[PDB]
Design a protein around this ligand. Structure first.
Ligand SMILES: *[C@@H]1O[C@H](CO)[C@@H](O[C@@H]2O[C@H](CO)[C@@H](O[C@@H]3O[C@H](CO[C@H]4O[C@H](CO[C@H]5O[C@H](CO)[C@@H](O)[C@H](O)[C@@H]5O)[C@@H](O)[C@H](O)[C@@H]4O)[C@@H](O)[C@H](O[C@H]4O[C@H](CO)[C@@H](O)[C@H](O)[C@@H]4O[C@H]4O[C@H](CO)[C@@H](O)[C@H](O)[C@@H]4O[C@H]4O[C@H](CO)[C@@H](O)[C@H](O)[C@@H]4O)[C@@H]3O)[C@H](O)[C@H]2NC(C)=O)[C@H](O)[C@H]1NC(C)=O
Ligand SMILES: *[C@@H]1O[C@H](CO)[C@@H](O[C@@H]2O[C@H](CO)[C@@H](O[C@@H]3O[C@H](CO[C@H]4O[C@H](CO[C@H]5O[C@H](CO)[C@@H](O)[C@H](O)[C@@H]5O)[C@@H](O)[C@H](O[C@H]5O[C@H](CO)[C@@H](O)[C@H](O)[C@@H]5O)[C@@H]4O)[C@@H](O)[C@H](O[C@H]4O[C@H](CO)[C@@H](O)[C@H](O)[C@@H]4O[C@H]4O[C@H](CO)[C@@H](O)[C@H](O)[C@@H]4O)[C@@H]3O)[C@H](O)[C@H]2NC(C)=O)[C@H](O)[C@H]1NC(C)=O
Ligand SMILES: *[C@@H]1O[C@H](CO)[C@@H](O[C@@H]2O[C@H](CO)[C@@H](O[C@@H]3O[C@H](CO[C@H]4O[C@H](CO)[C@@H](O)[C@H](O)[C@@H]4O)[C@@H](O)[C@H](O[C@H]4O[C@H](CO)[C@@H](O)[C@H](O)[C@@H]4O)[C@@H]3O)[C@H](O)[C@H]2NC(C)=O)[C@H](O)[C@H]1NC(C)=O
Ligand SMILES: *[C@@H]1O[C@H](CO)[C@@H](O[C@@H]2O[C@H](CO)[C@@H](O[C@@H]3O[C@H](CO[C@H]4O[C@H](CO)[C@@H](O)[C@H](O)[C@@H]4O)[C@@H](O)[C@H](O)[C@@H]3O)[C@H](O)[C@H]2NC(C)=O)[C@H](O)[C@H]1NC(C)=O
Ligand SMILES: *[C@@H]1O[C@H](CO)[C@@H](O[C@@H]2O[C@H](CO)[C@@H](O[C@@H]3O[C@H](CO)[C@@H](O)[C@H](O)[C@@H]3O)[C@H](O)[C@H]2NC(C)=O)[C@H](O)[C@H]1NC(C)=O
Ligand SMILES: *[C@@H]1O[C@H](CO)[C@@H](O[C@@H]2O[C@H](CO)[C@@H](O[C@@H]3O[C@H](CO)[C@@H](O)[C@H](O)[C@@H]3O)[C@H](O)[C@H]2NC(C)=O)[C@H](O)[C@H]1NC(C)=O
Ligand SMILES: *[C@@H]1O[C@H](CO)[C@@H](O[C@@H]2O[C@H](CO)[C@@H](O)[C@H](O)[C@H]2NC(C)=O)[C@H](O)[C@H]1NC(C)=O
Ligand SMILES: *[C@@H]1O[C@H](CO)[C@@H](O[C@@H]2O[C@H](CO)[C@@H](O)[C@H](O)[C@H]2NC(C)=O)[C@H](O)[C@H]1NC(C)=O
Ligand SMILES: *[C@@H]1O[C@H](CO)[C@@H](O[C@@H]2O[C@H](CO)[C@@H](O)[C@H](O)[C@H]2NC(C)=O)[C@H](O)[C@H]1NC(C)=O
Ligand SMILES: CC(=O)N[C@@H]1[C@@H](O)[C@H](O)[C@@H](CO)O[C@H]1O
Ligand SMILES: CC(=O)N[C@@H]1[C@@H](O)[C@H](O)[C@@H](CO)O[C@H]1O
Ligand SMILES: CC(=O)N[C@@H]1[C@@H](O)[C@H](O)[C@@H](CO)O[C@H]1O
Ligand SMILES: *[C@@H]1O[C@H](CO)[C@@H](O)[C@H](O)[C@H]1NC(C)=O
Ligand SMILES: *[C@@H]1O[C@H](CO)[C@@H](O)[C@H](O)[C@H]1NC(C)=O
Ligand SMILES: *[C@@H]1O[C@H](CO)[C@@H](O)[C@H](O)[C@H]1NC(C)=O
Ligand SMILES: *[C@@H]1O[C@H](CO)[C@@H](O)[C@H](O)[C@H]1NC(C)=O
Ligand SMILES: *[C@@H]1O[C@H](CO)[C@@H](O)[C@H](O)[C@H]1NC(C)=O
Ligand SMILES: *[C@@H]1O[C@H](CO)[C@@H](O)[C@H](O)[C@H]1NC(C)=O
Ligand SMILES: *[C@@H]1O[C@H](CO)[C@@H](O)[C@H](O)[C@H]1NC(C)=O
Ligand SMILES: *[C@@H]1O[C@H](CO)[C@@H](O)[C@H](O)[C@H]1NC(C)=O
Ligand SMILES: *[C@@H]1O[C@H](CO)[C@@H](O)[C@H](O)[C@H]1NC(C)=O
Lengths: 171, 610, 49
């Protein structure tokens, strides 16, 4: 019944310094170290840092020195990761995992993950209306295809079997 | 030709297992010291300690899984709660404070000290009183030119004040094993963390370890010999800490130059709270001074050894703390009754690569009075103020480092000092020890057979006895020559009144009652009796009640071992013998218990039956 | 045909006297499968308790 819960997907312009939360449950949180791993769509998993709950000790990777900082809170059994001065190359999915009971470099428990995309696009953003960001809600009278990424960054799609609600417009 | 099973009592065969150790510590004074580590509850060791050197014994132990560190750990933590429980509780001190910065010329001096007046209770319930005190910046937080301040622990945990009389000074305490158990002490100067120790001895209680809580630098520890040691569970894995042991001590001088004063303001009937009064003299920072020539020289010893694991020519840099609470980030240590917190950035900024003023290094140290030792939840201690100026001088004997990691390899290596846990402070001293239980019932085949059922001397100067468990590395024949040596020590004190003889003094445990070691002793003396009477009960069914060596009529099966009598007794230790027969030792104990000695009873009396 | 511990309590005095090591094993320590003394060996069970 042990599971790690991460924060939600967030979008930010370069230099925005996002923080992510990792909720622990089902076990004694103050025992095992928490690790932050990031995976790009065309790259393998990458290890960022580990922070243990008792004393907050943390070891950060060479390339993330001065860029990332991790802490935690015992009362909420949650470890946080502050990633300052984010860059266009650093857009990927962020996972927080816990080492297995064998104490070797293996991960037995993970989290659902958070989506962090860095880009320069306006927040405001059948045939589709420019609905940036990507999430849309298509419905017929109150077969859907994936979206396409243009050079401007706006997402276009199509739905064939409308009045699709837009989160930036709040219709 | 015909081989029969033989029972031996007192064979030097031991197995490692976890048992509840007790305490041993020399009596420094008849006395009110009330040292927290012991209230004199640990019974005093004999003036002369007996250490036995074992010949041809290669017993290895694992430092990281060593069970002795966790027992002490839970021992100090239990000892602290037993000392703070009788002290007064500062539950009424969680009151909105109105603080004014202490008299100081602001040049930036950014004094952490505050001067706060609060409405405190008094001896009478209806009456109150407006008294003032002084608190550092780390003890108070802002609650939304005096403004409202709140004590840091009020929102999270209750607080209790340490009794003024108890002293936090570390004293040596030895841990011994109960009767019927043994402790093996490695004497290898170049001993690695985990692995075989070619020269092993045995001792009843370990040399006393001064329990010193230190976060970044080990204090007043045991010096290494020759080259400094770099003990680690896995040097390649960064998660495990890197424990170091020094061969030359590095002296450190710490002071609190502020001449504080103690003000006892009665806050309850029979209860008195101790607050800081007017500070006499200049406002100064707490600082620690370490000589740079010696620190530069020692740091050069640690960096030389580290290259063996990572290569001759690689970049070995030292860095600062990379994060964590105030505990891990600074050199948190206690002195004179208060708790310093020293930034060690000046010690750990250096870069070493390949080869090729005389002023001391000074450390800005903060001081805090409200602390939660060992990151415990729901608890907090307020250390009372220490009147007058205090000085500290200790020896630095070890560090706790960390691997930086990263994607790049063989380009640069940086070590960041850290104090993640207090257990690593005990592994730095219990590394050379291991707990084993001795098992004295070793069976072996011999052509000797039981005296027929129908049937019915050297006086001394035996040579070169080896002491207790000394024959563990000698041949089975030579080891079988000394059986009364172990049988003496299976029960009661192994040496010099080791345990049972000690528990005789009055009011030692009566006053102690169940506090601390009092329950440790009962579990150690009852388990001793239960293991001794277990072997005697095993004999009672097996015959051989009063005999150290008995031969009874039981055939030795050839499938248990195909080795002949000579090769077994010519060049084998009882330890190696117990390993091969371990698979069949339980069956032998079943055939020999009834078929060997109860068939006799049913036949022996039938023989005389009417 | 051994009867186990106290199995000969309903048999004759002669038949019951045939099994005496059965009880003598069980008078002290665990009667069966590490029943008591073998169990109290794990650490921090009673110390914490
Ligand atoms: C006569 O006999 C009858 C039969 O035995 C008795 O009936 C029994 O009654 C008891 C209660 O008295 C029931 O226990 C409770 O069942 C609840 C429902 O169980 C669900 O989950 C079960 C297991 O699911 C876990 O493991 C499975 C795999 O096995 C896994 O797939 C799943 O994801 C999960 O990890 C599942 O088997 C059931 O079918 C159900 O799906 C269960 O929720 C209860 O747990 C509560 O309460 C208990 C007791 O108080 C706590 O010990 C638990 O920690 C948890 O308490 C929660 O609230 C607390 C407040 O103090 C928190 O402190 C806890 O942390 C916790 O909060 C939860 O959520 C957090 C957020 O994520 C987590 O972090 C925490 O971990 C917690 O999950 C409890 O088990 C029996 O189920 C029921 N029997 C049967 C057969 O159903 C009858 O009572 C007897 N008669 C009498 C008079 O007594
Ligand atoms: C911080 O770090 C510092 C170091 O940087 C730490 O300081 C060090 O602390 C340790 C203790 O932990 C001290 O060790 C003690 O040293 C003394 C002195 O030893 C010298 O004198 C011995 C006796 O002298 C004889 O001769 C003189 C005249 O010449 C007579 O006056 C005497 O009466 C004697 O007859 C002598 O034997 C010693 O020889 C040593 O050195 C030679 C090489 O020179 C070696 O080969 C020897 O093996 C030996 O090492 C030396 O000359 C010792 O005397 C202390 O030992 C005694 O006391 C112990 C406690 O009671 C006891 O257990 C020992 O058995 C021993 O008692 C013996 O000697 C007594 C006196 O003669 C007898 O009465 C007794 O019956 C028995 O025979 C101990 O070794 C360090 O010296 C000290 N460092 C310095 C520089 O001083 C500091 O503690 C650290 N702080 C921390 C960690 O908090
Ligand atoms: C040992 O450990 C220490 C402490 O971790 C390390 O030092 C940190 O180092 C930096 C400089 O590298 C210190 O600088 C502080 O910067 C603060 C904020 O500015 C930062 O961000 C801005 C942009 O927002 C940048 O322009 C700026 O350059 C910084 O990057 C200031 O607010 C700090 O002032 C603080 O102290 C004064 C009183 O002294 C207060 O009045 C202020 O309110 C504020 O508290 C300061 O200038 C920082 O102090 C150090 N702390 C941190 C946060 O880590 C060492 O590098 C490390 N190693 C060694 C060898 O010493
Ligand atoms: C930290 O602050 C402390 C005060 O809170 C300092 O304590 C002071 O220490 C000095 C000596 O170093 C004492 O002086 C002695 O006083 C006695 C008695 O004084 C009598 O005479 C004086 C006038 O000379 C008078 O004021 C007194 O009331 C007495 O009538 C003399 O006999 C000695 O010769 C010597 O002068 C101070 O008395 C003492 N203060 C207190 C309040 O007791 C302490 O020294 C400071 N820390 C450090 C490291 O210096
Ligand atoms: C110590 O306790 C005493 C009371 O025993 C405090 O004195 C009281 O301080 C309060 C403000 O905190 C005064 O309240 C005043 O109320 C009027 C309205 O009635 C308001 O207009 C004022 O602005 C103010 O809020 C109160 O009159 C005063 N005196 C009393 C109750 O006799 C004292 O401040 C406390 N000191 C501390 C907490 O440091
Ligand atoms: C008990 O009280 C203490 C003192 O107020 C709390 O400590 C502080 O808690 C805050 C979060 O509530 C920590 O984060 C802060 O967040 C704000 C919002 O972004 C930010 O502006 C601050 O600069 C700060 O990051 C804060 O670091 C922390 N400070 C200390 C010294 O501990 C504590 O959380 C309270 N605990 C409970 C259980 O109420
Ligand atoms: C710490 O203070 C002690 C004194 O309390 C210093 O010891 C002195 O060392 C010098 C030589 O370096 C001797 O001449 C003095 O006689 C020693 N003092 C005494 C009382 O014997 C020690 O050197 C200081 N160390 C540091 C690192 O500051
Ligand atoms: C630890 O101590 C070092 C000094 O030895 C501090 O370095 C300075 O902090 C000041 C802010 O008051 C900065 O302006 C300096 O730049 C820092 N030094 C360096 C070399 O950059 C360091 O900040 C301290 N860190 C902590 C957590 O106390
Ligand atoms: C570690 O020591 C070095 C010097 O060896 C310090 O370097 C200083 O760097 C500044 C520029 O940032 C120079 O202006 C100083 O003159 C240098 N120091 C000296 C003594 O010349 C470095 O800052 C130190 N780091 C820490 C954390 O203490
Ligand atoms: C008179 C005085 O000392 N005021 C200072 C104030 O300037 C400072 O900001 C505060 C920090 O906690 O401490 C107080
Ligand atoms: C960290 C380290 O150096 N470990 C070594 C280990 O690999 C080696 O097997 C042993 C040989 O005695 O010495 C030690
Ligand atoms: C006795 C022992 O453990 N020896 C090992 C050795 O076999 C191994 O090759 C080496 C690797 O570093 O570590 C050590
Ligand atoms: C046993 O130890 C002795 C020294 O006590 C040594 O002389 C002898 O060679 C050793 N024999 C074996 C087999 O280890
Ligand atoms: C007080 O500090 C200020 C800082 O600018 C300094 O200029 C002044 O000379 C100092 N005066 C005294 C009396 O300490
Ligand atoms: C409030 O500030 C004044 C001036 O600094 C001080 O005299 C007083 O003692 C402070 N506390 C109160 C009024 O409780
Ligand atoms: C002293 O430290 C410096 C680096 O800070 C180093 O270059 C020098 O070699 C050290 N001294 C000695 C005698 O090694
Ligand atoms: C020094 O490095 C050389 C070349 O790699 C190597 O042959 C030698 O064993 C090293 N010596 C020491 C003391 O590490
Ligand atoms: C030895 O005794 C075992 C039973 O303990 C039996 O199975 C075996 O046949 C006997 N003989 C030999 C030669 O192993
Ligand atoms: C049995 O003992 C004899 C004489 O020591 C020896 O030569 C022979 O190799 C041994 N064989 C076995 C199987 O132990
Ligand atoms: C044991 O030692 C004897 C010499 O005393 C030697 O002949 C024999 O080969 C050795 N056997 C083993 C296993 O060491
Ligand atoms: C012990 O018995 C096991 C099988 O239960 C066997 O695999 C092992 O090799 C035996 N070891 C010895 C030393 O007899």
């Amino acid at each position: 019944e042990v599971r790690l819960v991460q924060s939600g997907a967030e979008v930010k312009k370069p230099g925005a310094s996002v923080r992510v939360s990792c909720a622990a449950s089902g076990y004694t949180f103050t025992d095992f170290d928490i690790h932050w791993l990031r995976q790009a769509p065309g790259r393998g998993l990458e290890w960022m840092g580990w922070v243990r709950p008792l004393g907050g000790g943390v070891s950060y990777a060479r390339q993330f020195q001065g860029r990332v900082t991790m802490t935690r809170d015992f009362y909420i059994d949650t470890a946080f990761m502050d990633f300052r001065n984010l860059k266009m190359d650093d857009t990927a999915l962020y996972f927080c995992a816990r080492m297995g009971a064998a104490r070797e470099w293996d991960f037995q428990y993970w989290g659902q993950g958070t989506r962090v995309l860095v880009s320069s696009a306006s927040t405001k953003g059948c045939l589709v209306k420019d609905y940036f960001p990507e999430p849309v809600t298509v419905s017929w009278n109150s077969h859907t295809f994936p979206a396409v990424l243009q050079s401007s960054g706006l997402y276009s799609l199509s739905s064939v079997v409308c009045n699709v609600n837009h989160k930036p417009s709040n219709t | 030709e015909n081989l029969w099973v033989t029972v031996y009592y007192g064979v030097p065969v031991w197995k490692d297992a976890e048992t509840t150790l007790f305490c041993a510590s020399d009596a420094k004074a008849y006395e009110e010291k009330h040292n927290v580590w012991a209230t004199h509850a640990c019974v005093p060791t004999d003036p002369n300690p007996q250490e036995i050197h074992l010949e041809n014994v290669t017993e290895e132990f694992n430092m990281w899984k060593n069970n002795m560190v966790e027992q002490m750990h839970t021992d100090i933590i239990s000892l602290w709660d037993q000392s703070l429980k009788p002290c007064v509780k500062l539950t009424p001190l969680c009151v909105t404070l109105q603080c004014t910065n202490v008299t100081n010329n602001i040049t930036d001096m950014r004094g952490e000290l505050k001067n706060c007046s609060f409405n405190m209770t008094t001896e009478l319930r209806d009456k109150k009183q407006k008294v003032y005190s002084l608190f550092y910046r780390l003890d108070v937080v802002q609650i939304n030119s005096n403004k409202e301040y709140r004590l840091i622990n009020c929102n999270t945990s209750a607080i209790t004040q340490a009794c003024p009389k108890v002293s936090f000074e570390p004293i040596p305490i030895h841990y011994c094993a109960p009767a019927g158990f043994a402790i093996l002490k490695c004497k290898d100067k170049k001993f690695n963390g985990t692995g075989p120790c070619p020269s092993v001895s045995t001792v009843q209680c370990t040399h006393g370890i001064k329990p010193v809580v230190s976060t970044q630098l080990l204090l007043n520890g045991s010096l290494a010999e020759e080259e400094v040691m770099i003990r680690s569970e896995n040097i390649t894995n960064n998660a495990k800490n890197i424990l170091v042991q020094f061969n030359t001590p590095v002296q450190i001088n710490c002071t609190r130059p502020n001449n504080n004063t103690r003000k006892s303001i009665r806050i309850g009937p029979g209860q008195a709270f101790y607050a800081t009064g007017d500070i006499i003299g200049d406002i100064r920072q707490a600082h620690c001074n370490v000589s740079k020539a010696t620190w530069n020289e020692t740091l050069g010893k640690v960096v030389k050894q580290l290259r063996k694991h990572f290569g001759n020519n690689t970049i070995i840099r030292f860095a600062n703390s990379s994060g964590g609470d105030l505990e891990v980030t600074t050199h948190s240590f206690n002195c004179g009754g208060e708790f310093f917190y020293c930034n060690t950035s000046g010690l750990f900024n250096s870069t070493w690569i390949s080869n090729t003023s005389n002023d001391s290094i000074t450390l800005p140290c903060r001081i805090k009075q409200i602390i939660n030792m060992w990151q415990r939840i729901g608890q907090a201690m307020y250390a009372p103020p220490i009147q007058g100026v205090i000085r500290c001088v200790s020896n630095i004997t070890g560090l706790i480092l960390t691997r930086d990691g990263g994607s790049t390899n063989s380009t640069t290596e940086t070590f960041r000092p850290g104090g993640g846990d207090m257990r690593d402070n005990w592994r730095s001293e219990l590394y050379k020890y291991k707990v084993v239980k001795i098992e004295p019932l070793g069976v072996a085949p011999t052509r000797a057979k039981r005296r027929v059922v129908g049937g019915g001397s050297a006086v001394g100067i035996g040579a070169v006895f080896l002491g207790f468990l000394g024959a563990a590395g000698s041949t089975m024949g030579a080891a079988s020559m000394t059986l009364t040596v172990q049988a003496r020590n299976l029960l009661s004190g192994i040496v010099q009144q080791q345990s049972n003889l000690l528990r005789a003094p009055e009011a030692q445990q009566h006053l102690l009652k169940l506090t601390v070691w009092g329950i440790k002793q009962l579990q150690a003396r009852v388990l001793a009796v239960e293991r001794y009477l277990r072997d005697q009960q095993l004999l009672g069914i097996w015959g051989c009640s009063g005999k150290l060596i008995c031969t009874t009529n039981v055939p030795w099966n050839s499938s248990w071992s195909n080795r002949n009598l000579s090769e077994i007794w010519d060049n084998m230790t009882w330890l190696q013998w117990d390993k091969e027969i371990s698979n069949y030792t339980q069956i032998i104990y079943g055939l020999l218990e009834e078929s060997q000695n109860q068939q006799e009873k049913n036949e022996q009396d039938l023989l005389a039956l009417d």
